[PDB]
Amino acid sequence: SVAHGLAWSYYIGYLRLILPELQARIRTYNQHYNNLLRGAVSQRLYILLPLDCGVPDNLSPNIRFLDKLPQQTGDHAGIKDRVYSNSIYELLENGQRAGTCVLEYATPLQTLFAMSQYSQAGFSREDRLEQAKLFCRTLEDILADAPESQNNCRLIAYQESFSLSQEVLRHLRQ
């Protein structure tokens, strides 16, 4: 299926590569690049999984972009020093800072949305919802048995006055 391939590519080509190094990158940021009065970046990659596949290019009102982690580079598929970058976000609640975390949308959901938009893909909006859920289930089952493993990332799936900050804060507060 469509979602089966997207989920395995998200793991094979991304999570498997950046999860084993995420802990070292976050500890580097907290010790050197963090401003004096800014909070420790929580561990773990928080992955946003909107089932409607609505992915804005700019995630950054209670979610404010702070900074980027140090880059991770590697050679892949003949591209020398392919760069992997992640963004740190501040989470506001009642005007007060409630958390800071590495946060991003699952990029394959943008592919599912584009396929529903383009007639040549032959892919309906109903197909999109079924495949989005199937993507999330496959990714969870992959991570459950993955050595790089689910303990470096949290999947935040949700369907849609929904508040995205409160959704992430609920996961960030255990």
Q: Which residues are annotated as a binding site for 2',3'-cUAMP?
A: 14, 82, 107
Count other Cβ atoms within 10 Å, centred on residue 7: 24
Ramachandran bin of 149, using left for φ above 0, alpha for ψ from -120 to 50, beta for the remaining angles:
left
Between 46 and 75, how does the x/- string for binding to ligand 9UR read (CB under 6 A)? ------------------------------
Token duo for residue 137: 């289930």
Euclidean distance between CA atoms 174 and 6, whole angstroms: 28
- Give min distance, CB of 150 to its own copies, in A: 14
- Continuous H helices in the chain: 2-10, 16-28, 108-117, 125-144, 164-172
Q: Which residues are annotated as a binding site for 3',3'-c-di-GMP?
A: 9, 14, 82-85, 107
Positions touching its own copies (CB under 8 A) are 1-6, 8-9, 12-13, 48, 55-60, 65, 68, 71, 74-83, 85-87, 89, 103-108, 110-111, 114-115, 118, 120-121, 131, 141-142, 145
